[PDB]
């Protein structure tokens, strides 16, 4: 499974 | 920020004429990922060619596997034709049985 | 042996040609099991290995939107990084992300990793300790400060030693038939006169798995890097790999060169020699 938590941008 | 493809043309199994096999063109080491790959049978573009999903290496350069089912013969010539920004003219690599 | 799970993502801006091409690929060891391709008809995370296909529609529903989210992050970041590096809006640029985790034979966590690249160069990477970041240059240090702010390292550590290690351990059992195998290299040598007085010795290794391998040429027991041609390890297309090494030798001295093959499925290092009578 991929990461669930959407990250903050760069 | 540009690397030229390394191109390898080969068969999935050792080649014996008359028996089904797979023709492989492996292009690795290139950047950027925009690339053009055609398999050639006596200089004519083979039409049912599949490929792998774009991935890349530790050094971030890309690699792709193009392949198609074929039956080697003595008379038939097979080549891979790759075009990339790093290339002034499409490079053509002929299938050699011991490479 | 050890096992790994890895996801690879590539985002390629196409200025004036619609949204960025986005391609995602998941692996267990050297076996691909999922993919997403923005340009593909499906617009869903699709399965790519037999043993993942049993997963229910909740699995594919989740993965589809998560992998799409990651895509949208890469969509903003393409614009942000364009600014950091003071680049025009007319060029095509590439973000690449790799992350995953490693476990041992008993399913215990060994390693987590995340690494990002911009235009094929190091941008920012998570350190081995999973607590801190290394930015590659001063622009990437802007991101490192943002991520140190929002504690991304700790939310990410959650996945890399937690979610990741459990789902790897499931997959490794859902697919225990195909994934636990090690195929050792079928080996053999060849010989090609280039003239009347020199020839090419070519040391082959075929059908092995996983893809890690070593080929080396020895002259009277000494390692020759002279005339040594080594190709990139390549996929057979059936789950196995091929590699060869070659050295050009003086015809009639083929007996003094020997080729050495090291691989995990090999009880001892293979040694091969051309055998003239």
Same domain, C258 and C150: no
How many CA atoms within 13 Å lie on the side-chain side of C98? 22
> Residue C211 has what DSSP assignment?
S
Name the residue among B9, B86, B12, B41 with its Cα closest to residue C240.
Answer: B12
Could you say which DSSP state residue C255 is in?
G
Tell whether C15 lies on the interface with B, counting CB pairs under 8 A.
Answer: no
Binding positions of C for a peptide antigen: 7, 73, 84, 116, 143, 146, 159, 171
Whichever domain contains C73, its CATH number is 3.30.500.10
- Same-domain check for residues C95 and C169: yes
Please say which residue of C118, C145, C179 terminates a domain. C179
Q: Would you call C234 and B26 a contact, using CB atoms and an 8 Å cutoff?
A: yes
Asked whether the beta carbons of C106 and C18 are under 8 A apart, the reply is: no
Chain B residues whose CB is inside 8 A of the C25 CB are 53-55
- Is the pair A, B in contact (3+ CB pairs within 8 Å)? no
Rounded distance between C-alpha atoms, residue C201 and residue C199, angstroms: 7
Final residue in a domain of this structure, among C179, C212, C241: C179
Asked if C233 and C252 sit in the same domain, the reply is yes
User: Domain segments of chain B: what residues?
Assistant: 6-94
Does residue C139 sit in the same domain as residue C250? Answer: no
According to DSSP, residue B31 is labeled B
Last residue of a domain, one of C179, C205, C235: C179
The experimental method is: X-ray
Mark residue C84 as left, alpha or beta (left: phi above 0; alpha: psi -120 to 50; beta: remaining): alpha
**Residue B42 backbone zone (phi > 0: left; psi -120 to 50: alpha; other: beta):** left
Instruction: Based on the fold, state whether residues C134 and C194 are members of the same structural domain.
Output: no
Largest distance between two CA atoms of chain A: 22
Question: The domain B6-94: what is its CATH number?
Answer: 2.60.40.10
**Nearest CB to A9: which of C7, C77, C159?**
C77
d(CA B34, CA B64): 11
Choose the closest CB to A9 out of C67, C73, C156.
C73
Show residues of chain B in contact with C244, CB under 8 Å: 99
- C141-180: b (≥16 Cβ within 10 Å) or e: ebbbeebeeeebbebbbebbeebbbebbbebbebbeeebe
List, in order, residues 6 or more apart from C53 with CB less than 8 Å away. C47
Helix (H, G, I), strand (E, B) or coil at C36: strand
Assess whether C100 and C32 both reside in one domain. Answer: yes
Q: Do C81 and A10 touch (CB under 8 A)?
A: yes
Resolution reached, in Å?
Answer: 2.5
Q: Give one DSSP letter per residue of B42-70, joined into a string.
A: TTEE-S--EEPPPEE-TTS-EEEEEEEEE
| Residue C265: domain span | 186-273
Same structural domain, C18 and C146: yes
Q: Do C15 and C118 belong to one domain?
A: yes
| Residues C228-234: contacts with CB under 8 Å, at least 24 apart | C231/B8, C232/B6, C232/B8, C232/B26, C232/B28, C232/B29, C234/B8, C234/B10, C234/B24, C234/B26, C234/B28, C234/B65
Q: Are residues C135 and C201 in the same domain?
A: no
Contacts of B17 (CB under 8 A, 6+ apart): B71, B72, B73, B74
Q: Are the C-beta atoms of B14 and B27 separated by less than 8 Å?
A: no
Domain tally, chain C: 2
């Amino acid at each position: 499974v991929v990461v669930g938590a959407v990250g903050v941008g760069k | 920020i540009q690397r030229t493809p390394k191109i390898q043309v080969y068969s999935r199994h050792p080649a014996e004429q008359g028996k089904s096999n797979f023709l492989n063109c492996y292009v690795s080491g290139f950047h950027p990922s925009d690339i053009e790959v055609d398999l050639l049978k006596n200089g004519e573009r083979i039409e049912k060619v599949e490929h792998s999903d774009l991935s890349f290496s530790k050094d971030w350069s890309f690699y792709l596997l193009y392949y198609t089912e074929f039956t080697p013969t003595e008379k038939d010539e097979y080549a891979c034709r790759v075009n990339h920004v790093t290339l002034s003219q499409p490079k053509i690599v002929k299938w050699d049985r011991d490479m | 042996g050890s096992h790994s799970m890895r996801y690879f993502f590539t985002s390629v801006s196409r200025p004036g040609r619609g949204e960025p091409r986005f391609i995602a690929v998941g692996y267990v060891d050297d076996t691909q099991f999922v993919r997403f391709d923005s340009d593909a008809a499906s617009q869903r995370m699709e399965p790519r290995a037999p043993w993942i296909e049993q997963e229910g529609p909740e699995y594919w529903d989740q993965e589809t939107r998560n992998v799409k989210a990651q895509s949208q992050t890469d969509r903003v970041d393409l614009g942000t990084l364009r600014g950091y590096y003071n680049q025009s809006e007319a060029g095509s640029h590439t973000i690449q992300i790799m992350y995953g985790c490693d476990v041992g034979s008993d399913g215990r966590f060994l390693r987590g990793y995340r690494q990002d690249a911009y235009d094929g160069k190091d941008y920012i990477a998570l350190n081995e300790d999973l607590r801190s970041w290394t930015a590659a240059d001063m622009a990437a240090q802007i991101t490192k400060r943002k991520w140190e702010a929002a504690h991304e390292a700790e939310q990410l550590r959650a996945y890399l030693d937690g979610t990741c290690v459990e789902w790897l351990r499931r997959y490794l059992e859902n697919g225990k038939e195909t994934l636990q195998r090690t195929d050792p290299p079928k080996t053999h040598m060849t010989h090609h006169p280039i003239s009347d007085h020199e020839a090419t010795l070519r040391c082959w290794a075929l059908g092995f798995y996983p893809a890690e391998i070593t080929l080396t040429w020895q002259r009277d027991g000494e390692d020759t890097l002279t005339d040594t041609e080594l190709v990139e390890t390549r996929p057979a297309g059936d789950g196995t790999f091929q590699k060869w090494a070659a050295v050009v030798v003086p015809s009639g001295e083929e007996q003094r060169y020997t080729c050495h093959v090291q691989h995990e499925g090999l009880p001892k290092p293979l040694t091969l020699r051309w055998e003239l009578s």
